[model samples]
Target: GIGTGFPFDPHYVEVLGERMHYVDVGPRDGTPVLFLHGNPTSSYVWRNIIPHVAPTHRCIAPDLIGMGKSDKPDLGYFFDDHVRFMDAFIEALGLEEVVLVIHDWGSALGFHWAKRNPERVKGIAFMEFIRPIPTWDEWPEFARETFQAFRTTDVGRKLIIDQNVFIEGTLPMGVVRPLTEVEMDHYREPFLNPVDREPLWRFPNELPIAGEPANIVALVEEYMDWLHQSPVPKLLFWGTPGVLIPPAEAARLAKSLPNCKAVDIGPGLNLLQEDNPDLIGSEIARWLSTLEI
Candidate 1:
């Protein structure tokens, strides 16, 4: 994603009385590949990876309701709220026999939807994600302290709402190689105002820990049970020292899934796409070749 540019055309569809921005490129014949992004990010994360798969299958990547080019309405950006629009978006486009490519909060959203609509979803590919409903101690000390502050105190407001720390701070720190000014600026364009920045802050709090956000824990655990037993194929990419899923956790999760393919997509932190787009893209393309769907 560093050197490669996002040259795809932008498209919009009305979902829940709002305009949802997306990239709907390549062919529409095969099983549709839907790429989903997480907190403080848009489908822009998949810009570089889409190219490898687009030639053979339809590629659809949407900016979630309050993030990226999507309309920022007053509706709650909770997990259920996100699924309401996302489910509507899927139905609006008549998408069936789908494959989900997800990251971070994207994994939670996609995994929940896939488990619920097992008849429609064919596969899932994820990275830098949350899973097995991790506990507080399970979270590495390095990252957990900052996340704890976000949930427990008012400091989160100062950093996220007032300062746009998601764009200016953590995002830059997540990638192994520094992102260019243009790339950072593109990410900054959508969340310029405090009002637009609310969605960014909500995600960190959504990270379930120490049994807080009990519903999130309940839901994640439920889906994880489904994920382990489900027949749907899974592909995961993990970097050496990833922010969330370090090598050990990556292997553990991969092994737990029923039908999974794990890839080491080289050096990176949370935003693996920016660090190793070539390998990530190729790996996804290769994995699809093995699937019957």
Candidate 2:
């Protein structure tokens, strides 16, 4: 059972020798909606949005390995590591015809999987997720500085490992409204100690920058190409003044994907799930209704 006012039972399945936790609700035979969350947050991030769409869909939100209630192993949390666990989870559950709703790193991981098995994915909805890394000339100075700091050794360790800033500060600060004590506690409990916070430090460093993390950069290139070629229905939800994907970028992406549609759901930031879960849910439901799938 999940606390923090999340109205769902917690279920666990063995994935790659570790216990992977997820929320499975609604009609068991209904269309499957797989919600994937990102760094510093867990399946809990989808708590509010799930209820709105659950009545008409089978909602499945998983806590990524090393985050939330999932078992954290002593391995570097690189892009491939996260994807391996995700692959295992999908295979273990025998899930197909997935409608992916992804945020943050979830976007990168989900897109990689979807590209590899486009037949398994029926549709996609995304917000504040990673895009192909722009060239140095294209980066805003502030963006470059922020990424550099995370890539730097000592500063990265201090901000993420020592302080747990992503969960304690970044998560709350990214949202429009401050998180309540209970909400904060729910996000913070997983990484209470320095040892358990390795994934936090590792994720930021994995961002494709300066052509480094060569593997992720290559994967992004491959997936971006797949995005253009794949005919799967795609919906992109963007918020005003968003940290990652802005309106302009969303429009560009929509143009690139043949069957893609973009929606501007105003006045929110990177973590739109925190700022406006209701709008996110409703918009997704509305868009889904229009899709033939």
Candidate 3:
């Protein structure tokens, strides 16, 4: 019953000549849940919940190239890069019949993968995520300004890495409950060096806001088309005050998905997992229990 957590056994596989890092969990035969993290965090974001679900569902969380214990090649940190790398990761692992749990940027990246290989997916669960829109001004001023700077200039990169914006911001925005120093330490462990922080720092500057992001408009169109047609069982775990991905967006997504369920949790944006973990967990478990497959 000893399942892996942080410091996980990572295997490096070549995707377009680039070595990508990934964490494989549970038994290969177990039902697999592919958990994709967004900006700043890596596969480790699921640490607290993985242990609870790993006994039955194989949870494989990868650091998405630049974020966790993965390769941090500067050239591989773009949004398109994340999508392609993820596809290559799936192919390299020979994954199939997967359940996807996506958050933040993870939603866009993971959905790109699912849309291309719809047959490989079983169900999808998204939390505080976005569905490609014509525009993205719904974000708060600070959040939008930070993203614009990061995406448009070099100084933003240095500020993001050297200043620990990704790691530190999560403390104030994401975790509502009083996280012990130990928990915060675990989250901060990966980006110990500038090199290790490349993906974390680069992901922001790479957003497709304003259609400047390469290949994004097309990808978003594709994903939207798939969402309209596909009948994948979907669940949305939304936080009320998330400045980045708002509750209104989650409500919109719920109305869009054919077989979807939505749960609105406390204090909005950052700390639903910390503040409402049990409620979210119970609802997810209940949904999973109802699955026919």
Candidate 4:
């Protein structure tokens, strides 16, 4: 088992001229399992879980552009930008037949990529990710109001960039278990300064609410249609009272995806990895075995 701290050494490569940070573990010859994090989280979020599957699978977890230990270049960190970097990173690694273990916005990234490059992807394992991001009238009043404020240009900048609310407030709020000082400190490393926090500031703004960003809404619609049609093996780990993809959404996704399994990982919120890493790890490991990837 892995220890309390992040035990893996940093790995890097040039993706679009920026230094992208990642953690590569397990046997190199093993089937590559790509772990993708979302929002404020980095590859550090998978610390506990990666150890569980690392023995037999080549697990590669990358911090998204500007989010983790990766170099922060000057760019608008939009969904389009993230998608570009992620695609390039995969090409750089020369990974094929990938088993994707994704969470949060990483699901969208992985799902979109898997949708585009279906031939290369082997299977997808996701939890509490973006599925059916609601129109303004479709979502709960609580989420609508909260994100409405967050989407507001000025308030969002103050809360996310200046004050750093994600690390300070919502991350622990999203996870059911308590995070140690060390764990929180590790997530806090990239957010220690204002410039380092731009990506965090930008993500919530691109939430595709009210279908404002026509392009993002279009992309989500396209990938979602592709998700429904694609027959790639899928595993969904869900929790009670989730933040993004709630229980109902999970159930919907479970049915919509033809080749899929839905497993309950007990109580959690958006960041289920923080609360149920071993459960996520063991469950996905078992599924991977069955998939023969």
Q: Evaluated with lDDT, which candidate comes out highest?
A: 1
Q: Highest TM-score: which candidate? A: 1
Model 3, position 31, has a per-residue lDDT of: 62
User: What TM-score should be assigned to candidate 1?
Assistant: 0.96
lDDT of 1 by residue, 61-143 (tens): 99999998999999657788888999999999998789889998888889989888998887899998876435677776666
Q: Against the true structure, candidate 2 has what lDDT? A: 0.83
Model 2 stretches astray by more than 4 angstroms:
1-4, 136-144
Q: Runs in model 1 with CA error above 4 Å? A: none
Clashes of 3: 5
Alpha carbon lDDT of each predicted model: 0.86, 0.83, 0.69, 0.85
Q: What TM-score does prediction 3 earn?
A: 0.85
Q: Which digits, one per residue and each the tens of the lDDT, describe model 4 over residues 42-79?
A: 99889888988898999999999998889899898999
State residue 9's C-alpha deviation in candidate 3, in Å: 5.8
- As a whole number from 0 to 100, the lDDT of residue 90 in candidate 4 is 95
* Candidate ranking (TM-score, best to worst): 1, 4, 2, 3
| Model 2, span 96-153: residue lDDT tens | 7889999999999899999999888889998888765656544445455655777777
Candidate 1, residue 30: Cα displacement in angstroms equals 1.6
Q: Which stretches of candidate 4 lie over 4 Å from their true place?
A: 1-3, 137-144
What's the number of clashes in each of the models? 0, 0, 5, 0
